[PDB]
A paper describes a structure:
The archaellum consists of an ATP-powered intracellular motor that drives the rotation of an extracellular filament composed of multiple copies of proteins named archaellins. Instead, archaella are structurally homologous to filaments of the type-IV filament (T4F) superfamily. As is typical for other members of the T4F superfamily, ArlB1 and ArlB2 consist of an N-terminal hydrophobic α-helical “tail” and a globular, C-terminal β-strand rich “head” domain. In the assembled archaellum, the tails constitute the core of the filament, whereas the head domains are exposed to the periphery.
Here, we use electron cryo-microscopy to elucidate the structure of the archaellum from Methanocaldococcus villosus at 3.08 Å resolution. The filament is composed of two alternating archaellins, suggesting that the architecture and assembly of archaella is more complex than previously thought. ArlB1 and ArlB2 alternate throughout the filament, following left-handed helical strands. Recalculating the helical symmetry of the archaellum based on this observation resulted in a helical rise of 33.4 Å (5.57 Å × 6 = 33.42 Å, refined to 33.4 Å) and a twist of −71.8° (108° × 6 = 648 = 720 − 72°). While the α-helical tail domains are identical in ArlB1 and ArlB2 (I14–A59), the head domains show differences with respect to sequence and structure. The most striking difference is a glycosylated outward-facing loop (K131–A137) in ArlB2, which is absent in ArlB1. While the head domain of ArlB1 harbours three glycosylation sites (N112, N133 and N176), ArlB2 features six (N70, N113, N118, N133, N134 and N180). In both archaellins, the metal ion is coordinated by five conserved residues, which differ slightly in their position along the backbone (D154, D156, S158, N166, D169 in ArlB1 and D157, D159, S160, N170, D173 in ArlB2). The flexibility of each archaellin is enabled by a hinge of two residues (Ser60, Gly61) linking the head and tail of each subunit. To allow for this flexibility, the tails in the backbone rotate around and slide along the filament’s axis, whereas the head domains swing diagonally to the filament’s axis.
Author numbering:
A (entry chain D), C (entry chain T), D (entry chain h): 13 to 66
B (entry chain S): 13 to 65
E (entry chain f): 67 to 225
F (entry chain R): 67 to 119
G (entry chain e): 118 to 221
H (entry chain g): 66 to 221
I (entry chain A), J (entry chain Q): 170 to 221
Amino acid sequence: AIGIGTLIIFIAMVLVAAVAAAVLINTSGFLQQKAMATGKESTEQVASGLQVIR
Amino acid sequence: AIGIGTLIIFIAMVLVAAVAAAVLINTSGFLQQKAMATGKESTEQVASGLLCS
Amino acid sequence: AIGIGTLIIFIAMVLVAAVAAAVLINTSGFLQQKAMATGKESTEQVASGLQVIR
Amino acid sequence: AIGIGTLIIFIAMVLVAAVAAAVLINTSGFLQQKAMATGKESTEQVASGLQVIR
Amino acid sequence: VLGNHSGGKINWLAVLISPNAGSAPIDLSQATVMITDGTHKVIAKYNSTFFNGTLKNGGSIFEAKYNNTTALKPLFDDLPATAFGIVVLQDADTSCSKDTPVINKGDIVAICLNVSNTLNLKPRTKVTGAVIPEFGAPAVISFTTPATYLDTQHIIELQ
Amino acid sequence: VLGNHSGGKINWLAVLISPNAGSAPIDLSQATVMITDGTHKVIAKYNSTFFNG
Amino acid sequence: TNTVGDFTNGIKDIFNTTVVKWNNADATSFVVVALQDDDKSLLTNAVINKGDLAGVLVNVSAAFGKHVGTRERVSGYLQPEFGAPAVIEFTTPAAFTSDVIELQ
Amino acid sequence: GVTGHYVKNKGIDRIVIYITPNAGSAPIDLKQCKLFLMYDGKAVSLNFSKYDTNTVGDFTNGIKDIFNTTVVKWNNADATSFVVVALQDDDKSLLTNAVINKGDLAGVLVNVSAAFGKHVGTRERVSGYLQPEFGAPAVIEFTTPAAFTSDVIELQ
Amino acid sequence: LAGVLVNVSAAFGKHVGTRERVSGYLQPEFGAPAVIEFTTPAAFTSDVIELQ
Amino acid sequence: LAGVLVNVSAAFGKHVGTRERVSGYLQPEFGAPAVIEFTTPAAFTSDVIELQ
Ligand SMILES: [Ca+2]
Ligand SMILES: [Ca+2]
Ligand SMILES: [Ca+2]
């Protein structure tokens, strides 16, 4: 029967789509930290300094 | 014998793709509303004001 | 056959991408007028006035 | 068997995604030069001039 | 957008329009224009009678003639209350013809509307609208008429 | 933010707050506020007794 | 007397009563005014096809039984016999200040 | 820049508009560009027209006087066109099929008194745009001074 | 990588002018064809032009 | 919304100093983990610090 294969290949299709989704979730995590830090750090740099009074 | 089944599962493929399409179409609709709303509202906020004379 | 669904979902994908594009085109229109007017008006305000001679 | 088509359509899907990627890589190239030149040129314009001494 | 003035009003408008970059050719004979002054909302459509091609080679807008068979008569004054006319200002490839005004990349053309009785464009008045093509994105008309009209300056630049 | 004062301290604070443009309605009865002075960190929640409409 | 109001050649004012014929907009129906249609499909048995643009008139004050006020929302869908529905959604502005308003 | 010639007891008769491309701009096909001008009662469009026998008048090596008739050949400035005089162009682009590219400077001649049908008087404004086939238009705007007092005036 | 030479002025019987488009396909015996499409620029100004 | 308490000085066996990073994940039984990442500031100057 044709049905048998249709089932089995569906199982595969789901699994592949899961793996594909995963990489985006993971990568978004990696980028989150890197972005946030870059902003904070850059801000502190501009905002700060010393001045010679006399 | 084989032929019969091929037809039947074909029907299912069609319907399942249809159901998935519905999600995408609908969802796009749902977002269209809020997308526009946000832009208009935000502009009116930044542009409007009163000034003491 | 797998091909049948691949076709049908493509039709959907196109349509959704169209709708998504539309909102940006529309919104850009709305903003165009609002921006242009705001600049003109503000300019005339600063540029103009009266002076008491005597 | 259902598997046969699943394979064949995958081949297509890959190829299309390749073509789609290509246009962005190409276009980014075109824009690179145009942008860089526009900045350089504009800078030289403002920065330069002559002065009548006497 | 440009606008002749007499009396207390702007009476004719000339809306200059052109294609967006990378657009397919737009057939203006099937366009529609919608304008409102906040008290009325006119909608107007092309009447083929009112075409002037010659101005692609230079001349005066706002004094263009048109050709009812056997005569020449002024365009703007004759144009009916529900119709717009068209005057070709730049077209390299003769793409605009009286029966089929199709505009392609590079062209500029003026949609001529006579609003004297239809919309009451006194000073300080907001005007809103769009030219809507058969396919593709509309052009947005949006202007507020000046605070003061002066008799030394009968043609006004509105947008 | 506004703040009554007596003695050597600010004793009450009144924090005026409003929605962002294009926001869906916010139910303050389920909000939480967190404040710190660098020596302690209080967290506080709504008591319905204290409403004035 | 006719299936769709033929204004393929323009309207002086879409809301002027004598020109437009609002009268059949009862508390339970709409009427359709044809604004662009090359192939005469709207004009004859009321079928929209590619490139047509048409305008639906609704007598809201009769439909909802009162006039809609300021700062109020209205939302809906025009649902065809088959295919995706057209979403409608707008919030009436804070200050009515002119006769014809661009709810958009 | 803009400059102009005053005929005594009449007003400004002709004007010369100096035009240049913006940094980084791709070459502009001058012969397709149209110039729109507004004044007290008229809004006129003018189209390119050939100088005598040649596409653009070649004065890459200097002019005794830009307004002297016999030197310059104003005659093709009809009531509906302009002509172009090439003032600096290394690569010969202006001189051959009329294309402005980087570093070129060129001057557009307009017979204003014929275009608007009268001489422009004192205390009057004139404004317009030279609109190319693609890209941003060059704005023109000036108010003629209160007192004409010399033959060539620097409307600028 | 290989380059196909075409004597266009002889093929179309005239030289292609400015602001004109040309489009086509190179169609192999089996498999997908290579699309060609370009519009000649507005201003010819150098001998070798990058129609791309 | 819930708050996890960790006795870091006991967990790592010493107090974390200035200019040091700490990173981790809270990994549920199924589903995506919550990333934690921060660098302690250069100058401790108050009792409760907003590592964020
Ligand atoms: Ca054309
Ligand atoms: Ca139709
Ligand atoms: Ca040159």
